[PDB]
Ligand SMILES: N[C@@H](Cc1c[nH]c2ccccc12)C(=O)O
Ligand SMILES: N[C@@H](Cc1c[nH]c2ccccc12)C(=O)O
Ligand code: SF4
């Protein structure tokens with residue numbers, strides 16, 4: 001029974017990849033009954049997108065609207081916006097005084113990802129503030145983000161040592177969910193036009209699935225394919241294909257006894273099954289205008305009072321006046 | 323008629339050097355009737371002294387007590403503590419997103435002054451926040467600190483350009499006051515035991531002045547000296563030696579017709595003249611316990627409301643939700 005913390009940067013409309021990776025895990029942690037703190041990391045959006053803020057406020061709200069459509073329940077999780085919890089800035093600043101420049105340079109997520117800014121360098125320090133300010137015990141993350149969890153633990157340890165013992169050492173909760181490719185085999189990116197937004201229509205989903213990439217081995221209908229080399233098959237898994245349906249595809253495809261059209265019809269049925277409730281939810285949320293604003297203010301108010309309680313300790317430990 | 327901003331790090335009891343350099347200029351700017359914002363930079367104390375915070379809160383208060391004893395009047399200046407104005411942390415963080423790592427590395431005050439920390443690198447960004455958050459027009463500084471004013475102007479310009487025009491470009495107000503050496507010729511440092519605290523007693527001042535270094539040329543009483551090579555002479559200037567008294571010293575010393583004892587008796591009279599009111603003031607302040615706490619809360623409350631007004635603009639310009 002745990003204190004979970006996680007966040008997402010508002011960079012746009014949420015797609016299939018945010019859902020089957022991150023958000024489903026978030027909802028699973030929520031339903032298992034842990035104390036979940038989930039937020040829109042709007043200040044992290046600035047570390048990389050300080051050149052285009054024209055849609056930041058708007059994307060921030062949309063991200064919260066999306067969390068909600070996907071099952072993030074504010075009656076049981078704390079949902080908030082990073083920029084509203086001013087205490088994160090203060091802790092980030094305070095932690096920056098105990099972390100070396102070289103240590104931030106070693107971060108792989110750094111040198112791998114304009115971005116020559118002080119802000120991008122201390123990104124992980126801010127991320128440590130986000131996690132440690134709610135004294136989180138678990139942080140759901142994909143293998144890619146593990147290095148930021150290790151630093152946070154170091155920060156916690158160096159802090160507890162130099163001052164007083166205030167912070168638990170948080171641990172990563174790794175996703176088993178495999179990364180989903182784009183609708184055309186390659187990685188998901190907006191520039192490749194291979195993305196599927198959660199808020200797509202049935203006609204547009206129907207058309208995106210039908211022109212989707214299949215195993216290039218199947219030049220003709222009579223040519224058998226190999227689902228391991230097929231994006232459609234990868235999508236079948238993300239959308240809860242039954243043991244029966246998967247034997248049908250596998251034996252169908254490999255024996256060249258089903259056509260990809262039929263195979264995609266099955267993905268459509270299953271992916272529409274997962275999306276229909278999310279689509280309904282987007283409609284229910286919009287009919288109560290202010291529902292999302294109310295959720296944001298209430299949620300951020302709650303995150304704030306937890307954060308403030310932690311800062312009282314932090315300031316007392318560092319012997320600061322205020 | 324201007325908006326003046328400046329601060330000092332609480333590193334200890336204030337001495338002669340804080341008074342005749344920085345504080346006298348502060349009081350002069352105050353008396354000329356400018357809008358002065360003066361504060362204890364307790365977070366900057368952490369950039370260098372994160373290893374010894376045991377006396378931080380205590381030194382912070384003492385620094386404010388000292389500002390007051392020296393004539394910083396809260397009925398006309400805004401006196402506050404940096405850590406109490408949380409908005410500084412937020413602006414610092416926001417400015418860090420628009421300043422390069424290399425630009426912070428170029429800062430001479432950096433590579434010239436443990437200190438391998440992220441916090442020490444972004445020190446000037448925090449200092450830009452301190453200055454630009456009150457939209458200051460003038461910042462009193464010694465030649466040494468000029469480079470931090472130039473960066474702040476760059477930050478302001480890059481911000482106004484990328485977002486909306488929120489900040490004036492502040493300018494440095496350079497001290498004419500020459501640096502005062504220690505009581506033994508060399509630079510002032512606590513490790514050389516050549517410092518004179520403002521809160522010294524008459525007996526201790528009397529004794530510190532009498533054993534003070536004189537021109538080594540005066541081996542004997544009959545040997546003339548050269549006041550330009552004498553620390554006592556340098557102190558005479560900081561303590562408002564009259565044209566008459568200075569002709570007496572100069573002709574006395576160079577003609578070997580006065581003795582250093584007599585010369586120091588004159589420094590004593592004059593330095594005691596400047597210190598007696600400050601000493602009385604320390605007594606008047608202490609008889610009203612809470613006077614300093616009241617001043618700190620009232621002052622910081624006032625700095626906060628100005629700072630918050632500036633942040634509303636900053637957040638609106640960067641299109642952040644909160
Ligand atoms: N940009 C970060 C956002 C973030 C900040 N703090 C976090 C804590 C946990 C997870 C994510 C975060 C990310 O995508 O990971
Ligand atoms: N350490 C800085 C303190 C400071 C922060 N902001 C400032 C603005 C003006 C003057 C001083 C400051 C200094 O001594 O200069
Ligand atoms: S039958 Fe299905 S798994 Fe096989 S290549 Fe076609 S779309 Fe892909």
Ligand code: SF4
Nearest residue numbers: 547552554575582585
């Ligand atoms: S007479 Fe005065 S100025 Fe000359 S060496 Fe002595 S103390 Fe110094």
